[PDB]
């Protein structure tokens, strides 16, 4: 509601202190807007580690999915925020969550050749054989984006 929007905005803008005040005024940690985007999605996308931690501590749903099927973990991998990816995984994030097109966080990290994120993901059980709507795997995504390096590594199919 009132505090609902405020929390999303603060989380997006990395206003750590604003988040503190809002939570104290009864703001819902799991407030979701029109598209199903939660404060956790926005902090995971913007790369605000301290805020991600705070929301998780207050009970933020680690696997909330928006209208496109994205979980905070998808946004973290796509935006290259390794620290946030780790925290999410430690709080129970589904390493193999799939969006509406069947893409997993591994597919997204693959599009950019994020080696460290790929490792943390694999370690947590990411299915390297997972296929999306276009029948593509993380490997196929690496070639389509010209990430020869990551491509050669994902060779462990």
């Amino acid at each position: 509601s009132d505090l609902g929007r405020k929390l999303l905005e603060a989380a997006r803008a990395g206003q750590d202190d604003e988040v503190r005040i809002l939570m104290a005024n009864g703001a819902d940690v799991n407030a979701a807007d029109n598209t199903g985007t939660t404060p956790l999605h926005l902090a995971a996308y913007s790369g605000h580690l301290e805020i991600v931690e705070v929301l998780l501590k207050h009970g933020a749903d680690v696997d909330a999915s928006d209208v496109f099927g994205y979980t905070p973990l998808h946004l973290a991998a796509y935006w290259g925020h390794l620290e946030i990816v780790e925290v999410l995984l430690k709080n129970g994030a589904d390493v193999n969550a799939m969006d509406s097109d069947g893409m997993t966080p591994l597919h997204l990290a693959a599009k950019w050749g994020y080696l460290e994120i790929v490792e943390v993901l694999l370690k947590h059980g990411a299915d390297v054989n997972a296929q999306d709507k276009f029948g593509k795997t993380a490997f196929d995504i690496s070639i389509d984006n010209g990430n020869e390096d990551l491509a050669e590594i994902l060779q462990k199919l």
Partner: protein
């Protein structure tokens, strides 16, 4: 022996009036220039015989309806005069293979960018995601433009094959709509993915985009010559250039051609023809009105080459030439409604790209296929 003219209030009617001043000083024909609001919505009501202006100035798209109900006279410029104008501009004033008005100015969207934030703007849409991540790290946004009107998102959607109505030598096939094809779907899906990945927000409108760019918050925006003055006031170091390509194909923005039509019920058609071809459609003629209010790119090759020295005008003309002339047929009205709904629903996930475009296709008067 009197020529009455109707022109919008945002145009240079003072300069145009100055033009009719010379005509009157060589023939004695009293030239009157008026600019009543709702003139375009009023013309078909007042011009329906009885009496209305002799010459009406307006975007060519509105002239299709006028010709539909026989409200405009068929003009017949000679092969010599026709060569003074860019060929594609004559295609915007055609109705059933019959010229119904004279091309005056040309407008189309261009890519506007902050030179300080972005030295060399992207030549392709595909590069934008990477560019946005690079800029987001420096506290900046790559691109921000009005996503609420299909007029602004069409350039991308049409790039790989999409189109409104098929145009074939002087005519539109009103039943052949191109919003449901593979090209349109490819473009709209690329746009949705930008929103899905947070490179853009589905709620960004005209005002939000404008303020963000003029405040140096975003590296680029998409807009026409009408937005230039406000950017000058913001003092942002900006450039205007060709729109990015999508799948190697140029973005195809809608082209609008300010045109002057003659009232089919006008008793003095020869005069009107004389005025337009020999007094307005000349280097001095257009320059007279341009000084009172900039026209942007121009249909008259002659004066266009002089104006094209301004790189912004050269970009406008380059984008227009690569664009899609806005269809002047009545069906466009439903097209706008249908497509606006499709993009908004696709962008918010309320509908899938396929679903959304399938609805837009039939809503525009086309067949699924």
């Amino acid at each position: 022996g009197k020529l009455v003219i109707w022109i919008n209030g945002d145009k240079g009617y003072n300069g145009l009036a100055e033009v009719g001043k010379k005509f009157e000083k060589d023939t004695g024909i009293k030239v009157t220039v008026e600019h009543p609001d709702k003139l375009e919505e009023k013309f078909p009501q007042v011009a329906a015989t009885g009496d209305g202006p002799d010459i009406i100035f307006w975007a060519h798209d509105r002239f299709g309806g006028y010709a539909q109900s026989g409200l405009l006279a068929e003009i017949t410029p000679d092969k010599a005069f026709q060569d003074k104008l860019y060929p594609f501009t004559w295609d915007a004033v055609r109705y059933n293979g019959k010229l119904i008005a004279y091309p005056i100015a040309v407008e189309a969207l261009s890519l506007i960018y902050n030179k300080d934030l972005l030295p060399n703007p992207p030549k392709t849409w595909e590069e934008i995601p990477a560019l946005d991540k690079e800029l987001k790290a420096k506290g900046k946004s790559a691109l921000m433009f009005n996503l609420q009107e299909p007029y602004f998102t069409w350039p991308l959607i049409a790039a790989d094959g999409g189109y409104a109505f098929k145009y074939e030598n002087g005519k539109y096939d009103i039943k052949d709509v191109g919003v449901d094809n593979a090209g349109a779907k490819a473009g709209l899906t690329f746009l949705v993915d930008l929103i899905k990945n947070k490179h853009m927000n589905a709620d960004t409108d005209y005002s939000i985009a404008e303020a963000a760019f003029n405040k140096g918050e975003t590296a680029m925006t998409i807009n026409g010559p009408w937005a230039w003055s406000n950017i000058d006031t913001s003092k942002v170091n900006y450039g205007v250039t060709v729109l990015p390509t999508f799948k190697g194909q140029p973005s195809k923005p809608f082209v609008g051609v300010l045109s002057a039509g003659i009232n089919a019920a006008s008793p003095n058609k020869e005069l009107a023809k004389e005025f337009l071809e020999n007094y307005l459609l000349t280097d001095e003629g257009l320059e007279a009105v341009n000084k009172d209010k900039p026209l942007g790119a121009v249909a008259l090759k002659s004066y266009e080459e002089e104006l094209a020295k301004d790189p912004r005008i050269a970009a406008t003309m380059e984008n227009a030439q690569k664009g899609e002339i806005m269809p002047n047929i009545p069906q466009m009205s439903a097209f706008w409604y249908a497509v606006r709904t499709a993009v908004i629903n696709a962008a918010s996930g309320r509908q899938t790209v396929d679903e959304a475009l399938k609805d837009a296709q039939t809503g525009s008067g086309g067949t699924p296929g």
